[PDB]
Design a protein around this ligand. Structure first.
Ligand SMILES: *[C@@H]1O[C@H](CO)[C@@H](O[C@@H]2O[C@H](CO)[C@@H](O[C@@H]3O[C@H](CO)[C@@H](O)[C@H](O)[C@@H]3O)[C@H](O)[C@H]2NC(C)=O)[C@H](O)[C@H]1NC(C)=O
Ligand SMILES: *[C@H]1O[C@H](CO)[C@@H](O[C@@H]2O[C@H](CO)[C@@H](O[C@@H]3O[C@H](CO)[C@@H](O)[C@H](O)[C@@H]3O)[C@H](O)[C@H]2NC(C)=O)[C@H](O)[C@H]1NC(C)=O
Lengths: 214, 215
């Protein structure tokens, strides 16, 4: 029942910090008996994977994870990266590939919402952002407050879903993100921003500002 | 890998249509050979399961589902219900339990959003609803248009999540977001829409907010 997954980097690590890693996860290993996880890149050059990590599980199994740095330029070029697992119980090696989307691509539309008027009596108000119409589904949302990054613990973003069949090359997707802010700060004119990070955007990210209107 | 899932009744079934059912889903069945799905409860009383339903799939496997009517009162009571599956490939019976969360409750707050002004030049606009601040996490969202029900295929609601710690919210409060794309002409023409939340903590177990284009 050995399963192998090749996990793509997050849009944030690819397009904001440019320090992305590919990750390979192997599950349901009966042991590390002749276990090996190896990476291959399609083009000339080398890869330098991090040390592989073995975890024990309560269900009596083992999992192995291996991460490898990938440059954003290499990712964007369309290069394919392949992880392969060998094991005593594996008659044939298992491989999975990961690479930048080659299917249809469509940039996200970003719609910021100010607090509902009925929230303004409360000590905190909700700023939110609908991001929709995009392909592929991989997207990251970040927030800024007075031009500085907001910690992830201070907002929440919904898991990406296909849009309803009426909303519009296949499904498009959407996410919604919201951030509770102090009412005094909102009323004070602080500028906030919701940022989408997505491969189909001109510069790979775009932001829309929110600020109280006079 | 035969798997078993126990599925609670929805708030709509519990409070609106009053036809709640517990459901059991078995996946990856190689066959119906010696298949049996049985239910048990905690209090004295005979459960009356619906007949089992089987489906053959393209991936070669079979799935089975079993539904059992449950009264809203019995569900709200916190009684635990268990579905058990036996099959020739199972050395021992497989079981899962389902029951209501009986912790503290808090009613949702519903905030409807008209289309962003930038959407009005498109052929469709998005109506949406943020529903937040509630406990427990079980909730159902429905939409109406001119007092008529909108089919579930015409809108999407996000999977419920805990709110961020600053929200702030007992323990965690939860939120969902629901949106419905409508023809811009229907919005501009003055149709009255409504987003409705069904939740156990509301006085009448539901509440709604209307959305209509303003002058
Ligand atoms: C035994 O117990 C472990 C407990 O974790 C199970 O491993 C989990 O297996 C699932 C898939 O079967 C993994 O989900 C995967 O998540 C990645 C993203 O992280 C996603 O890309 C894949 O689609 C996949 O769904 C999960 O990560 C993994 N948990 C960990 C941390 O290793 C295992 O399945 C159990 N085996 C049995 C049958 O008892
Ligand atoms: C072969 O195809 C069938 C049908 O697509 C697959 O059956 C499905 O299996 C998944 C889980 O692996 C089920 O998802 C479950 O959905 C319930 C809905 O309440 C959810 O609560 C659970 O958390 C779970 O994720 C899915 O319902 C089930 N059947 C259907 C109708 O899709 C099956 O997995 C495939 N088998 C293999 C091994 O290829």
């Amino acid at each position: 029942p050995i399963q192998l997954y090749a996990i793509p980097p997050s849009p944030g690590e690819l397009y904001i910090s440019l320090d992305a890693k590919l990750r390979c996860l192997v599950v349901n290993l009966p042991s590390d008996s002749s276990l090996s996880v190896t990476w291959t890149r399609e083009k000339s050059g080398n890869l330098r994977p991090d040390p592989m990590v073995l975890q024990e599980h309560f269900n009596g199994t083992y999992s192995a994870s291996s991460a490898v740095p990938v440059s954003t330029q290499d990712w964007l070029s369309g290069e394919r990266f392949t992880c392969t697992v060998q094991h005593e119980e594996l008659p044939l090696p298992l491989s999975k590939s990961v690479y930048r989307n080659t299917g249809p691509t469509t940039p996200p539309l970003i719609y910021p919402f100010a607090p509902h008027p009925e929230e303004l009596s409360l000590s905190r108000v909700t700023l939110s952002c609908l991001v929709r119409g995009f392909r592929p589904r991989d997207i990251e949302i970040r927030w800024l407050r007075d031009h500085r990054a907001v910690p992830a613990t201070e907002f929440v973003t919904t898991a990406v879903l296909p849009e309803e069949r009426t909303a519009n090359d296949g499904d498009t997707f959407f996410v919604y993100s919201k951030m509770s802010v102090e009412t005094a700060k909102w009323n004070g004119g602080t500028v906030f921003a919701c940022m989408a990070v997505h491969e189909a955007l001109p510069m790979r990210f775009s932001q829309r500002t929110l600020q109280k209107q006079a």
